[PDB]
Symmetry: none
Subunit: 37 residues, 4 copies
């Protein structure tokens, strides 16, 4: 069970990484938008 | 015990998946307001 | 140990709730930009 | 095992706090774009 919990935490870590990649993509769009106001 | 921890991890993972989907939708909406597509 | 894990998981859940509140606020600003 | 689990929970909490702060920054940036046109 200690290894099982560590694996579940690793899965959560991967989803946090995917969220960080979406945040970066949003910031990229905001930078483009900022030129156009 | 161990089973209840595993359930809480499943709920956390599911919520992170939903947050990720919402961020992807926000990114698409932002991209669409730019002058060039 | 089990109570500590439960408390840590409750704190994580509360932060997820706060994140959903910020998402709603982002959506409000974007809707204002497009209104 | 208990110390390792606590450390990973602290990492998850810290990642979520950082995600929340990035979202607050995105919200504030969008508000600036809203005001300036
Ligand atoms: Cu956990």
């Amino acid at each position: 069970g200690l290894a099982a919990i560590k694996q579940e935490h690793a899965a959560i870590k991967q989803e946090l990484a995917a969220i960080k990649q979406e945040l970066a993509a949003i910031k990229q769009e905001l930078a483009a938008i900022k030129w156009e106001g």
